[PDB]
Design a protein around this ligand. Structure first.
Ligand SMILES: CC(=O)N[C@@H]1[C@@H](O)[C@H](O[C@@H]2O[C@H](CO)[C@H](O)[C@H](O[C@]3(C(=O)O)C[C@H](O)[C@@H](NC(C)=O)[C@H]([C@H](O)[C@H](O)CO)O3)[C@H]2O)[C@@H](CO)O[C@H]1O
Ligand SMILES: CC(=O)N[C@@H]1[C@@H](O)[C@H](O[C@@H]2O[C@H](CO)[C@H](O)[C@H](O[C@]3(C(=O)O)C[C@H](O)[C@@H](NC(C)=O)[C@H]([C@H](O)[C@H](O)CO)O3)[C@H]2O)[C@@H](CO)O[C@H]1O
Ligand SMILES: CC(=O)N[C@@H]1[C@@H](O)[C@H](O[C@@H]2O[C@H](CO)[C@H](O)[C@H](O[C@]3(C(=O)O)C[C@H](O)[C@@H](NC(C)=O)[C@H]([C@H](O)[C@H](O)CO)O3)[C@H]2O)[C@@H](CO)O[C@H]1O
Ligand code: NAG
Ligand code: NAG
Ligand code: NAG
Ligand code: NAG
Ligand code: NAG
Ligand code: NAG
Ligand code: NAG
Ligand code: NAG
Ligand code: NAG
Lengths: 314, 168, 314, 168, 314, 168
């Protein structure tokens, strides 16, 4: 009597500790290469920001009017997105983004700042609605008349909540020293800000910048987080974009940046900019910067795991 | 390596589509090829056990620390890239070694199932037959398709057919 | 004759390359879970800062009066700790901490700044000793009278040592533009600072902040390190907290933050906030941020290493 | 896997509290169970060698880069967390594979000590006895407790008791 | 007949999963320890900066006159190197270095700034050529006379290229408020700068610093990158070092810091400060901070891989 | 471990400079030691295969993120150092385990080449000889240097010299 083992015509070359290109009966892939070119978002509360920028949802330019109080398990930023109508930017902008991405959305609340002896309806043609408007969550404070001084005001807001309050203010940088006075009167303008955690102060900086959205002035956007029972105070005298409402993080979420469509037909957990990686495999060779619940990125295109014995033909 | 598959057995049976291991006899009543469940299954259940280890889930979420639409500051940018590439090298190394190590063991344990089958059947037959040396057993008492099926299911009597084959 | 192997009634389930839940005769644990809830500090020179903050040991608020020249192999920060009497904070505060944690303690030295035509005994009720006092290693420079100007002074200090000298100065931010003048006279106040390595300058920023310790003013604390034979110069005109003594790192140490007691009865080398990890095991599932000489953190609660053979009963 | 422990030996001797491997005979002078030092010890000294590798020290100190009482700046905060979690995944992976790999080998080397013991005793006895096939040896010359103790300590004569068992 | 295996008199002790110090017939080393104490630069376009600092190649102090438009596959910084003639430094200096190291060299281009109603030939004895000179790629703008005011000028430059343009400007910090006026007239001087990406502004800070190269004044060097078709504008009124030429990255390179000679006789790819690591071995115990195409650093001095069987003598 | 080299073979042949494995006989026509290519070569070609795996290239360039002539800012400085040391520990761990794992397998596969050679020669000789038990084979039919060279090259007849040795 004789005994033996099975074999096949064409087997699969694998690599071992000692060999390279040894054919086995059967093998399986370990590295994922198959991508689905859509944001698989089945079962998740999804928010496609589109033209609205993530930081815009706090300040409220026209693009983000529909996102002032959003709520999501999954947040998608888009390339066409924008945090700004009137040209300007955020100091520490990327930290703020990473905060908002995992915030689970935001909840707004009036801070209740009242204004006597100044103007309040500052607007621009860079922020269009009916006509010229402004940031929806902010207020362009101004001198009463078409010139004159600006009283050294002081506003304060206490976070009566159990959660940290996202406070955001703005420094207007006029086109010139002429423009700065026409808006807030002459003199060194100083915006000071403090809390039981924070400590800083701001001066405008008039001067010609190139035109973005049609404007040469800029708006520095700054921010701090107010702890429960802690108070924040705004000592200012001009060149100042006042916060109208504060923000609170709803809960938990994940944030991605992508250029592909949303598909409620498939469920994903590992995302990247070119779609969703659905796989049980321990590794992947698709995107090193993929985020979520993902397999590990590897340089190798393929690593075949033997699922059979040595393959020897006659 | 146990030295059986691609050892003292020069080929494999491509005709064996029924299982991984089996017997091919040659007596008088014609010819037939079989298959061995307990050897095939134990090796199959071990390879299957390897994939179930490989395929695994993580409740380990990872977030962004980079920005593709708006490049972060260069210093932190390079520290991040440097770190990501450092981890990438580790995982590429891990993945390559794992597969190489697993494949080495997969093959060897398959070859270790051939030898494990062999030597036990060799033990059933006692001195009533002798090792040909090339995976075959030379019997000196003619066994039939009713008797052959009694060796396949481990029921052959290791004595009640012996004395006959002894003289031969 | 027959041969065989030993076996037991109840064995231990372990996991293998191919199996999961295979019982062996005996197994041992690989992941550490047993913590001791005290700072095991036997044989080490230990310093429990208690109410004193680490950064306080340089400036010297009343809490840190007993820590102005400490010396340690092991430094313990406490939650109740505080770097400050008069409200304020350090720029680049966390870098400075990491420096002090591994400093092996500090040694102070007079810089010898002399003062003509100003005041020198500025104090506050936020820093109590006999009555109202100030930072022990600093000096609240002031105008001679209850108003008036402040001469553009210039002080300099050369590190005559073989080691880098920790220099620290302070910028007083008055409650108002009235308060700033009452202390240092009117005008734009400017504190400039440089070395053969450093290059910076500072302006105060008066304005109302909330009251901490009873005060609305703040003190910015800044610092730089002076290399051997390098010189530092302080060009200033007011709103300036002068350094009285410089600091030198004694040697080497480790710094931890904890909320548990000190135990000179046990020896530790791997610490965390909830105690000490004493173990020979290669891994641990206690605190991912444990520091010192520690086993590697792993997510797994348990990983049993087989110390025996297969266990098969009759 | 060598196919012995949980192979052609269906059970283990729970009565054997004396060692890892041993002999259990059955002649005329009653009955007795023993233990084998050199087989038990060599396997024990190998498992012991594994723990001494596992338990190891590092003069590799690590410091704080985080702050629990006063949270660092968010950007650097997240880069630090991201890095720490990345390393945590590596060490969790390493730890799991190590144990799985070691356990696989521990078991196999233990089974490889049974077969290593067996085949050498089978060699001592020459043709004076034959393999039963289930871990037992059928002798055709009755051996006694003075003779049995001569096989246990590798002193049995592989010829000076042969011719008798040959006819049988 | 008898069979067996070979053996040797003196074998090699290796370590295993279960053993430690087991002798094998033959073994090979896995950790690299042999260093070559030269920069192996065969086949590569190499640039030894020597006394010129990397950041100097943009500003152009006398040391870097021969490096204003360099081109390299490999860049070597030297300890004696210096980015500066007139004392000062770069803000965000290390980021800029890492940019220049992998730039493959730089290409300069005139920005074409024209000047009416000011002076332009500011120099110093810290930058010697014929006699007192200045940075070659910069321009020390100045008031027409030995005092007087400085017109609020505004210069602009558009990157007409397909690549980002490295823009660099400088803020002069005078020794005193007297010196600042003598150069640029009295008043708060303000240099503002913006683009479709950038947003900032700068004020000088007169005051006494120690003397470096013979001077107590400093020059802050700042920089930004201009994207294709984006424009940058310089709103300024004094205390300002104007950019004469912009810079463009040639391609790709690698940058190292070393103190050993260049050797065109050997080929390297893994470098460190003490030479070149030429090896096929997967690991190394030479320099943890080695850069290029290198083996992995390990703590171990030696890890012997068995290339033979067990070695047992009679 | 297969139990051969440093198993039932107590020593190694230092006189064997010709190869890894070989035969040393003792008949009447004097004496001689040989060497076995196919056993030596297969084991050599496997060890060689291990170094070719170890020695490998990376098109993975790494840059500076530190500065030796001008120390970076302390906060980022320590994050960088902390990260570098974290990776250093991983690679030191990987390197140690790899070598230990490879060495364990290298030794075992070498011992597995001895046993693989042995048992096949034992199969050639059939019942015409018996296992001495210590790596030697006791023949009961005198073989010569022309016949010995026929066992070395796997050409010995497993029957046409049998009946003679059977009576003995
Ligand atoms: C050569 C000449 O006479 N040209 C004028 C021309 O100035 C004028 O355009 C206006 O230009 C000014 C600057 O000179 C501003 O840019 C005006 O824009 C707005 C804006 O939309 O943002 C108008 C708005 O009312 C302003 N809001 C407030 C609260 O001040 C803002 C604001 O000042 C800036 O955003 C802050 O920097 O400016 C713009 O109308 C045209 C049209 O009037 O007529 C020519 O004769
Ligand atoms: C409505 C009214 O008249 N109330 C006064 C009230 O102002 C006064 O309290 C004092 O309040 C002032 C501010 O107005 C300061 O806060 C004083 O505090 C001290 C301090 O302890 O820090 C006193 C100390 O002498 C000062 N030191 C120096 C060197 O200046 C400091 C210092 O100015 C600040 O810290 C810098 O901002 O202020 C406090 O006495 C009370 C008691 O006098 O009487 C009411 O009538
Ligand atoms: C006690 C006394 O009278 N001593 C003078 C002494 O001042 C003078 O030395 C000069 O000192 C001045 C400062 O007072 C500067 O340091 C001069 O140096 C230069 C330089 O080389 O950099 C000269 C140069 O022409 C200047 N360039 C421009 C564009 O201004 C620079 C420039 O001002 C600074 O770099 C900016 O801070 O300064 C130096 O000649 C000596 C020699 O004149 O005579 C004594 O009587
Ligand atoms: C090939 O490999 C995979 C993994 O084991 C398996 O699912 C598939 O059925 C195999 N093909 C054969 C021959 O059964
Ligand atoms: C905050 O202050 C309020 C004052 O009424 C107090 O009731 C509450 O307990 C405080 N909340 C926290 C966070 O302890
Ligand atoms: C980091 O890597 C990405 C690609 O992964 C690259 O595009 C980017 O330029 C790098 N970041 C920096 C700041 O160099
Ligand atoms: C169980 O395992 C450990 C590790 O080998 C050992 O110290 C202990 O003695 C074992 N128990 C038995 C059965 O000896
Ligand atoms: C520093 O300067 C002094 C001046 O006396 C000199 O003696 C000493 O050698 C210098 N120290 C160093 C660090 O070289
Ligand atoms: C980093 O992780 C810790 C827990 O390990 C968490 O509490 C903290 O919020 C994280 N840091 C930041 C800045 O998100
Ligand atoms: C020792 O080891 C190396 C690696 O296999 C090999 O190149 C060298 O020839 C060996 N020496 C002997 C004994 O051949
Ligand atoms: C930049 O602007 C010019 C204007 O002529 C245009 O022709 C060119 O296509 C633009 N370049 C890019 C980067 O698209
Ligand atoms: C980082 O490590 C290096 C040595 O590798 C050391 O010299 C340096 O001081 C460390 N950096 C910081 C900022 O502590």
């Amino acid at each position: 009597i004789c005994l033996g083992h099975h074999a096949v015509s064409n087997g699969t070359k694998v690599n071992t500790l000692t060999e390279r290109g040894v054919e086995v009966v059967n093998a399986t892939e370990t590295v994922e290469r198959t991508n689905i070119p859509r944001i698989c978002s089945k079962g998740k509360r999804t928010v496609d920001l589109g033209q609205c920028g993530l930081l815009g949802t706090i300040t409220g330019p026209p693009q983000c009017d529909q996102f002032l109080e959003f709520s999501a398990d999954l947040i998608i930023e888009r390339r066409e997105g924008s945090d700004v109508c009137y040209p300007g930017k955020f100091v520490n902008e990327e930290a703020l983004r990473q905060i908002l991405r995992e915030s689970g959305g935001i909840d707004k609340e009036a801070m209740g700042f009242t204004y006597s002896g100044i103007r309040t309806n500052g607007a621009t043609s860079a922020c269009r609605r009916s006509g010229s408007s402004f940031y929806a969550e902010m207020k362009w404070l101004l001198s009463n008349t078409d010139n004159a001084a600006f009283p050294q005001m002081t506003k304060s807001y206490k976070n009566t909540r159990k959660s940290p309050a996202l406070i955001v203010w703005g420094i207007h940088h006029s086109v010139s020293t002429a423009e700065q006075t026409k808006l807030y009167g002459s003199g060194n303008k100083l915006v000071t800000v403090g809390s039981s955690n924070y400590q800083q102060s701001f001066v405008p900086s008039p001067g010609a910048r190139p035109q973005v959205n049609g404007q040469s002035g800029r708006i520095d956007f700054h921010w701090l987080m107010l702890n429960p029972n802690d108070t924040v105070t705004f000592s200012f005298n001009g060149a100042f974009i006042a916060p109208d409402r504060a923000s609170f993080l709803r809960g938990k979420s994940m944030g991605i940046q992508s250029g592909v469509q949303v598909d409620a037909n498939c469920e994903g957990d590992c995302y990247h900019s070119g779609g969703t990686i659905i796989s049980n495999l321990p590794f992947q060779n698709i995107d090193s910067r993929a985020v979520g619940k993902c397999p590990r990125y590897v340089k190798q295109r393929s690593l075949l795991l033997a699922t059979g014995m040595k393959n020897v033909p006659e | 390596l146990f030295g059986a598959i691609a050892g003292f057995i020069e080929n494999g049976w491509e005709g064996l589509i029924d299982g991984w291991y089996g017997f091919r006899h040659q007596n008088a009543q014609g010819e037939g090829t079989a298959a061995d469940y307990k050897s095939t299954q134990s090796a199959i259940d071990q390879i299957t056990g390897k994939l179930n280890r490989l395929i695994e889930k993580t409740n380990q979420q990872f977030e962004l620390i980079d920005n593709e639409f708006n490049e972060v500051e260069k210093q932190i940018g390079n520290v991040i890239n440097w770190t990501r590439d450092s981890i990438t090298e580790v995982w590429s190394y891990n993945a390559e070694l794992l597969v190489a190590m697993e494949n080495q063991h997969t093959i060897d344990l398959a070859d270790s199932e051939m030898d494990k089958l062999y030597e036990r059947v060799k033990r059933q037959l006692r001195e009533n037959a002798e090792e040909d040396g090339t995976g075959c057993f030379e019997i000196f008492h003619k066994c039939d398709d009713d008797c052959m099926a009694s060796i396949r299911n481990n029921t052959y009597d290791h004595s009640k057919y012996r004395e006959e084959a002894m003289q031969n």
